[PDB]
Amino acid sequence: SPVFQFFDWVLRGTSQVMFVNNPLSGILIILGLFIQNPWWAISGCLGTIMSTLTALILSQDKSAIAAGFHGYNGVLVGLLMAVFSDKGDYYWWLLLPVIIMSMSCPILSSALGTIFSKWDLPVFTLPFNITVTLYLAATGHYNLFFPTTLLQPASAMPNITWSEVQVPLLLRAIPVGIGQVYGCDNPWTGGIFLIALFISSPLICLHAAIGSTMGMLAALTIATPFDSIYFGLCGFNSTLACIAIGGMFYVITWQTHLLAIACALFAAYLGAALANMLSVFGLPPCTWPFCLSALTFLLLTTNNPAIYKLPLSKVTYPEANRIYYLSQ
Amino acid sequence: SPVFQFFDWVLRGTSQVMFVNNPLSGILIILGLFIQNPWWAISGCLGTIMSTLTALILSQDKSAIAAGFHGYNGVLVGLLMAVFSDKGDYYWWLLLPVIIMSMSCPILSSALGTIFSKWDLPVFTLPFNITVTLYLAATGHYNLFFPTTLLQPASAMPNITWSEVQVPLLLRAIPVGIGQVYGCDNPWTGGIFLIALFISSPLICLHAAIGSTMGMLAALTIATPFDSIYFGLCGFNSTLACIAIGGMFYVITWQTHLLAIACALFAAYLGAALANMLSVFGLPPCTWPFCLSALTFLLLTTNNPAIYKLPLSKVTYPEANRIYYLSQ
Amino acid sequence: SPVFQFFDWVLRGTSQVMFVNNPLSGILIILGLFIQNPWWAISGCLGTIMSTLTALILSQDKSAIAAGFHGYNGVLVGLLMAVFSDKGDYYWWLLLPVIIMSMSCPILSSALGTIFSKWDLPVFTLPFNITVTLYLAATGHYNLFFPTTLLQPASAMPNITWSEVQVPLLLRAIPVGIGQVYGCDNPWTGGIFLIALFISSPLICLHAAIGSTMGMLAALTIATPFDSIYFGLCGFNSTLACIAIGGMFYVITWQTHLLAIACALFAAYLGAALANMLSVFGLPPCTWPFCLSALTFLLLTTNNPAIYKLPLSKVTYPEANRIYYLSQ
Ligand SMILES: CC(=O)Nc1ccc(NC(=O)c2ccc(C(C)=O)o2)cc1
Ligand SMILES: CC(=O)Nc1ccc(NC(=O)c2ccc(C(C)=O)o2)cc1
Ligand SMILES: CC(=O)Nc1ccc(NC(=O)c2ccc(C(C)=O)o2)cc1
Ligand SMILES: CC(=O)Nc1ccc(NC(=O)c2ccc(C(C)=O)o2)cc1
Ligand SMILES: CC(=O)Nc1ccc(NC(=O)c2ccc(C(C)=O)o2)cc1
Ligand SMILES: CC(=O)Nc1ccc(NC(=O)c2ccc(C(C)=O)o2)cc1
């Protein structure tokens, strides 16, 4: 049935946010979002629905829609409309900007796909980043219709007392970090995301956890305030980068594992940098550092035979990628 | 006569600002600029003269100069030197920065032409945007020689009373929007621009009017203050985008008409976004949103046979483009 | 001996900052840095050591390492860690960020090398600019570990009294300008840099001096405060641009000499522009204008046979380049 096929496409799209392609993973992600906030989940699901539908509308590639490569940007768009809204939860007028920007996502996903086709690089979350930055800059904190949360630059020296760091909460920053990929902050939605990643590919889960831990640790090395690390606002740019470089767009080897860790460090430090730069505009560093760091690590040309950049036409999940590479 | 040939080249250049190639259209545009401000028109005409002359100087392509593709950036440069100047009208020292930056325009127009040659995209107004942003950032509001008008970010919630909107002035925002392509604000110079566009291609006029109206309407959907919409500071990024996607760089079809309308919406919202971001630097969103939106709509790859991206070597005006396409 | 080979590679790397490839030039540059500040020189030398070492680590090209194209970014990174540090000289904890960012430089140098390979353009200092901007934005002035010097935008009209300009100091801005390529401010380290450039290629020295003078003069045309020009914060973006366009990446001709002067003007004005824009973030215009101006002048396509863009595989120094061109 066409309706069932479209629903399958929309679940897969949700999943593609943590680099997974599995309807069960998508349904678990939706369950976790319902655990966090029903309003956020409704906005995100509507966003991915509109993104996929307009992907079909503008005669896009059927395989890309069927694999969810046109619905992962929309779900994030809806979620961070619902996160960076000052009007409070269940503000139904916020759905209209979700409509417009979700329809706008595939246009960017195709234009940037044409730009990044020469060098064979994925668009990543760049269509989303552009769309949500456009929204949060066009509106800002001072609308009468769709205001946003006020983000301000640091103007005083932070007070960090290292003798009162909560190590248990610091370790809790790992599951919370895997859940800020969607902007959620509940530890249990993070655990649900871990399970959803594991049911598809265990190596994706391992890289996500190690990247979140590594983004935490990189945040502690520049005296980032403890409140953020606990929420994960430090961890997420690192999870996506680690999953990207570990086994998704390379072949998994120990050299590539170390390169993924290095990309996680670069993503964390670039997260701090872009969070301090984009804050003057009133904008958050919403998955820009992941995009830039993982693009600059995927463009790396090295003579090491172990670091092999897989063609984009043969990327499903790290285990299948590894088997494909040893087969050839 | 070489002098007459150069004058013909300079008139055509002026016209190329609203996507038209006709000396009569150029002379009508110059007449409209004289209606608005003799000082602004003098600065802009000198800017396009220098841009064309330095295009000949740096051994650029003869056809591009003869068709005005090297004088449209300069005229805008001169005009927005004369608009964003705090020293008042008839400040003769402002001509020297016009000299320098107009000479700088073709260099960018060729460099970005080489960058955008692989994907077959026009440079658009990017050489101008870079040049005028460079000027207005290098000087700013606090020089002793060439100060600029102070642009500040929003710091208070605007007071919009929808019961006192001037609908007649709101509809007047359409001709005013077609005149802010040159930075002018007189309704009658807008009407002169409409006539100049119509004498060449009626479809360009239709797309310009519909894009200005659409940029207006998109501005009203984010509670943009009424004073700006009336001036058109909302309308212009949409006119150029609509003319671009309607019949200039595509073949005119109903699908392409709807895509041009969508590009107009994207240009308007990106205009709001970049006007709120670039304001912190003290810079205006001078035709950046048109460039970005129309590039991201011209890079779109779709399977729909009706959306055909014309080769850049066969783009004159939408009617000729349509006849060329049906001929082949 | 491998140790001697690595030391030779590291000296050459230092030199490549002023577009020179000569171990004697490198040792003279290190001597000049020791004249300026032993702490800055230690940080910069450690930075280039780490950059070269990680270039070998990530299986990069042997010829590029042996010619120093992977150590020039690191030395600048270390130097401007030591310049933009608020903790004072001999703050040993600053070495760790130097480690991390110097290791990060070759990754960007390879990624951007792959991007700029299609159009045959050099990466320039872009890997460095990205790395140091990332550092100075991630930390800023308000850390507890690695604070930076506070940079603020202009908020009042500067008071310039042209009747009390120090012409001798103004002329001293030329050697000081050739020394701000490394962030040093001593006139004598500038003279040592002049000698180091001359021992390799006199034409590099001539272009550097003329570019520094031209950046000075371009700074005086926009009422730049006299204190900066004396330090050279105006001169350096122009020296590198002039050396780039004169004889390094083109064949030296009078037309190309004038084009190099024009690139110096563009670099100076873009230096002012980016110094006023990036200041709101708290960031300096650390060799961004040189990169952008010289890229936009190296992408220029002109019909003039005298302006010949040399293939990147045959660029050693302007005299050898000229002899190579006349040979073919
Ligand atoms: C020929 C070609 O480009 N194919 C191709 C294009 C794009 C992608 N991208 C992804 O799977 C993807 C994009 C973004 C993300 C995330 C989680 O950020 O994941 C795969 C294959
Ligand atoms: C002082 C300051 O900037 N705090 C601050 C730091 C980071 C962010 N960004 C996010 O929370 C965020 C959440 C989710 C995302 C996604 C899904 O891309 O991005 C906001 C505020
Ligand atoms: C081979 C090739 O690129 N030819 C080619 C290059 C550039 C253009 N551009 C234009 O006509 C143009 C540029 C900018 C604008 C406006 C009004 O913004 O209009 C056409 C043909
Ligand atoms: C608060 C605020 O930013 N107001 C504001 C909004 C928009 C502009 N931009 C322009 O007026 C403009 C005029 C003409 C152009 C062209 C020819 O590109 O660009 C200035 C100030
Ligand atoms: C095939 C190819 O790209 N070869 C190639 C690549 C890069 C360079 N770059 C340089 O020498 C260089 C880079 C940066 C600088 C400075 C002082 O900024 O100088 C030469 C040749
Ligand atoms: C008000 C203001 O911005 N002053 C200001 C102007 C310019 C700079 N930039 C530099 O000093 C600099 C030094 C060395 C470099 C290199 C090696 O790239 O870049 C800092 C402060």
PDB file of C-alpha atoms in Angstrom, chain B residues 69-189:
ATOM      1  CA  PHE B  69      27.690  41.593 -18.022  1.00  0.00           C
ATOM      2  CA  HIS B  70      30.487  43.687 -16.587  1.00  0.00           C
ATOM      3  CA  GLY B  71      28.716  46.967 -15.864  1.00  0.00           C
ATOM      4  CA  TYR B  72      25.668  45.889 -13.844  1.00  0.00           C
ATOM      5  CA  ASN B  73      27.706  45.279 -10.714  1.00  0.00           C
ATOM      6  CA  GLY B  74      29.385  48.676 -10.918  1.00  0.00           C
ATOM      7  CA  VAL B  75      26.198  50.724 -11.198  1.00  0.00           C
ATOM      8  CA  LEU B  76      24.812  49.069  -8.079  1.00  0.00           C
ATOM      9  CA  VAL B  77      28.142  49.692  -6.344  1.00  0.00           C
ATOM     10  CA  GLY B  78      27.951  53.404  -7.068  1.00  0.00           C
ATOM     11  CA  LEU B  79      24.287  53.617  -6.123  1.00  0.00           C
ATOM     12  CA  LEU B  80      24.767  51.991  -2.732  1.00  0.00           C
ATOM     13  CA  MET B  81      27.862  54.034  -2.050  1.00  0.00           C
ATOM     14  CA  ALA B  82      25.569  57.024  -2.480  1.00  0.00           C
ATOM     15  CA  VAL B  83      22.764  55.458  -0.414  1.00  0.00           C
ATOM     16  CA  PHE B  84      24.812  54.253   2.563  1.00  0.00           C
ATOM     17  CA  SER B  85      26.742  57.493   3.024  1.00  0.00           C
ATOM     18  CA  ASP B  86      26.324  59.602   6.159  1.00  0.00           C
ATOM     19  CA  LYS B  87      27.969  62.699   4.655  1.00  0.00           C
ATOM     20  CA  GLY B  88      24.853  63.744   2.748  1.00  0.00           C
ATOM     21  CA  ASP B  89      24.176  64.206  -0.928  1.00  0.00           C
ATOM     22  CA  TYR B  90      26.719  65.795  -3.271  1.00  0.00           C
ATOM     23  CA  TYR B  91      29.737  64.713  -1.216  1.00  0.00           C
ATOM     24  CA  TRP B  92      32.237  64.616  -4.047  1.00  0.00           C
ATOM     25  CA  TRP B  93      34.956  62.748  -2.149  1.00  0.00           C
ATOM     26  CA  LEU B  94      32.750  59.650  -2.257  1.00  0.00           C
ATOM     27  CA  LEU B  95      33.594  59.235  -5.948  1.00  0.00           C
ATOM     28  CA  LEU B  96      37.067  57.858  -5.198  1.00  0.00           C
ATOM     29  CA  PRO B  97      35.822  54.740  -3.338  1.00  0.00           C
ATOM     30  CA  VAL B  98      33.385  54.343  -6.226  1.00  0.00           C
ATOM     31  CA  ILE B  99      36.380  54.375  -8.592  1.00  0.00           C
ATOM     32  CA  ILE B 100      38.291  51.772  -6.611  1.00  0.00           C
ATOM     33  CA  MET B 101      35.435  49.378  -5.958  1.00  0.00           C
ATOM     34  CA  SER B 102      34.003  49.622  -9.467  1.00  0.00           C
ATOM     35  CA  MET B 103      37.429  48.697 -10.798  1.00  0.00           C
ATOM     36  CA  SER B 104      37.444  45.816  -8.303  1.00  0.00           C
ATOM     37  CA  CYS B 105      34.083  44.415  -9.452  1.00  0.00           C
ATOM     38  CA  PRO B 106      35.170  42.665 -12.707  1.00  0.00           C
ATOM     39  CA  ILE B 107      38.021  40.895 -10.906  1.00  0.00           C
ATOM     40  CA  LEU B 108      35.499  39.205  -8.627  1.00  0.00           C
ATOM     41  CA  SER B 109      33.117  38.703 -11.553  1.00  0.00           C
ATOM     42  CA  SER B 110      35.823  36.715 -13.341  1.00  0.00           C
ATOM     43  CA  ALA B 111      37.145  34.796 -10.329  1.00  0.00           C
ATOM     44  CA  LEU B 112      33.674  33.724  -9.225  1.00  0.00           C
ATOM     45  CA  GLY B 113      32.843  33.058 -12.862  1.00  0.00           C
ATOM     46  CA  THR B 114      35.698  30.555 -12.907  1.00  0.00           C
ATOM     47  CA  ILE B 115      34.499  29.003  -9.642  1.00  0.00           C
ATOM     48  CA  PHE B 116      30.873  28.744 -10.823  1.00  0.00           C
ATOM     49  CA  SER B 117      31.864  27.535 -14.295  1.00  0.00           C
ATOM     50  CA  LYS B 118      32.041  23.856 -13.349  1.00  0.00           C
ATOM     51  CA  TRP B 119      28.391  23.706 -12.276  1.00  0.00           C
ATOM     52  CA  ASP B 120      27.269  26.254 -14.924  1.00  0.00           C
ATOM     53  CA  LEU B 121      25.872  28.908 -12.645  1.00  0.00           C
ATOM     54  CA  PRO B 122      25.929  32.688 -13.088  1.00  0.00           C
ATOM     55  CA  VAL B 123      28.003  34.864 -10.754  1.00  0.00           C
ATOM     56  CA  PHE B 124      24.818  36.851 -10.090  1.00  0.00           C
ATOM     57  CA  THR B 125      25.451  39.908  -7.954  1.00  0.00           C
ATOM     58  CA  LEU B 126      28.070  38.195  -5.814  1.00  0.00           C
ATOM     59  CA  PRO B 127      30.944  40.308  -7.090  1.00  0.00           C
ATOM     60  CA  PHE B 128      28.914  43.393  -6.129  1.00  0.00           C
ATOM     61  CA  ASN B 129      27.864  41.972  -2.743  1.00  0.00           C
ATOM     62  CA  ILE B 130      31.474  41.193  -1.871  1.00  0.00           C
ATOM     63  CA  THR B 131      32.657  44.615  -3.022  1.00  0.00           C
ATOM     64  CA  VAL B 132      30.014  46.686  -1.227  1.00  0.00           C
ATOM     65  CA  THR B 133      30.228  44.574   1.930  1.00  0.00           C
ATOM     66  CA  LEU B 134      33.990  45.113   1.846  1.00  0.00           C
ATOM     67  CA  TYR B 135      33.454  48.867   1.561  1.00  0.00           C
ATOM     68  CA  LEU B 136      30.763  49.174   4.225  1.00  0.00           C
ATOM     69  CA  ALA B 137      32.764  46.994   6.615  1.00  0.00           C
ATOM     70  CA  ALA B 138      36.133  48.651   6.011  1.00  0.00           C
ATOM     71  CA  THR B 139      34.622  52.065   6.676  1.00  0.00           C
ATOM     72  CA  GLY B 140      31.605  51.639   8.926  1.00  0.00           C
ATOM     73  CA  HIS B 141      29.858  54.467  10.723  1.00  0.00           C
ATOM     74  CA  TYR B 142      33.000  55.807  12.406  1.00  0.00           C
ATOM     75  CA  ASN B 143      35.396  57.161   9.776  1.00  0.00           C
ATOM     76  CA  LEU B 144      36.708  60.654   9.287  1.00  0.00           C
ATOM     77  CA  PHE B 145      36.489  60.364   5.479  1.00  0.00           C
ATOM     78  CA  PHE B 146      33.735  57.975   4.315  1.00  0.00           C
ATOM     79  CA  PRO B 147      31.292  57.176   7.126  1.00  0.00           C
ATOM     80  CA  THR B 148      28.206  55.055   6.559  1.00  0.00           C
ATOM     81  CA  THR B 149      24.679  54.980   7.916  1.00  0.00           C
ATOM     82  CA  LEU B 150      24.372  53.274  11.290  1.00  0.00           C
ATOM     83  CA  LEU B 151      22.592  49.914  11.157  1.00  0.00           C
ATOM     84  CA  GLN B 152      21.741  48.329  14.491  1.00  0.00           C
ATOM     85  CA  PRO B 153      20.176  45.027  15.574  1.00  0.00           C
ATOM     86  CA  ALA B 154      16.733  44.848  17.102  1.00  0.00           C
ATOM     87  CA  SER B 155      16.884  45.229  20.877  1.00  0.00           C
ATOM     88  CA  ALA B 156      13.195  45.673  21.741  1.00  0.00           C
ATOM     89  CA  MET B 157       9.952  43.994  20.776  1.00  0.00           C
ATOM     90  CA  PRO B 158       8.438  45.919  17.840  1.00  0.00           C
ATOM     91  CA  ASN B 159       5.009  47.477  18.242  1.00  0.00           C
ATOM     92  CA  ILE B 160       2.840  46.457  15.282  1.00  0.00           C
ATOM     93  CA  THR B 161      -0.810  47.532  15.258  1.00  0.00           C
ATOM     94  CA  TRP B 162      -2.467  45.557  12.470  1.00  0.00           C
ATOM     95  CA  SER B 163      -5.619  47.702  12.698  1.00  0.00           C
ATOM     96  CA  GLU B 164      -3.714  50.693  11.270  1.00  0.00           C
ATOM     97  CA  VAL B 165      -2.005  49.072   8.278  1.00  0.00           C
ATOM     98  CA  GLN B 166      -2.108  51.261   5.169  1.00  0.00           C
ATOM     99  CA  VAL B 167      -3.331  48.866   2.481  1.00  0.00           C
ATOM    100  CA  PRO B 168      -2.833  51.473  -0.297  1.00  0.00           C
ATOM    101  CA  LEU B 169       0.784  51.943   0.782  1.00  0.00           C
ATOM    102  CA  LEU B 170       1.070  48.171   1.125  1.00  0.00           C
ATOM    103  CA  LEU B 171       0.080  47.799  -2.523  1.00  0.00           C
ATOM    104  CA  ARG B 172       2.436  50.665  -3.378  1.00  0.00           C
ATOM    105  CA  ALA B 173       5.168  48.404  -2.012  1.00  0.00           C
ATOM    106  CA  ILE B 174       5.129  46.583  -5.382  1.00  0.00           C
ATOM    107  CA  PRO B 175       6.466  49.420  -7.602  1.00  0.00           C
ATOM    108  CA  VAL B 176       8.679  50.561  -4.729  1.00  0.00           C
ATOM    109  CA  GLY B 177       9.998  47.017  -4.483  1.00  0.00           C
ATOM    110  CA  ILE B 178      10.968  47.021  -8.128  1.00  0.00           C
ATOM    111  CA  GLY B 179      12.908  50.162  -7.490  1.00  0.00           C
ATOM    112  CA  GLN B 180      14.887  49.027  -4.544  1.00  0.00           C
ATOM    113  CA  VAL B 181      16.805  46.859  -6.947  1.00  0.00           C
ATOM    114  CA  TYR B 182      18.689  50.113  -7.450  1.00  0.00           C
ATOM    115  CA  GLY B 183      18.207  51.354  -3.890  1.00  0.00           C
ATOM    116  CA  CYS B 184      15.737  54.047  -4.966  1.00  0.00           C
ATOM    117  CA  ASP B 185      12.508  54.568  -3.044  1.00  0.00           C
ATOM    118  CA  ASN B 186      10.321  56.739  -5.265  1.00  0.00           C
ATOM    119  CA  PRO B 187       7.161  55.014  -6.545  1.00  0.00           C
ATOM    120  CA  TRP B 188       7.541  56.723  -9.916  1.00  0.00           C
ATOM    121  CA  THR B 189      11.063  55.431 -10.477  1.00  0.00           C
TER     122      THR B 189
END
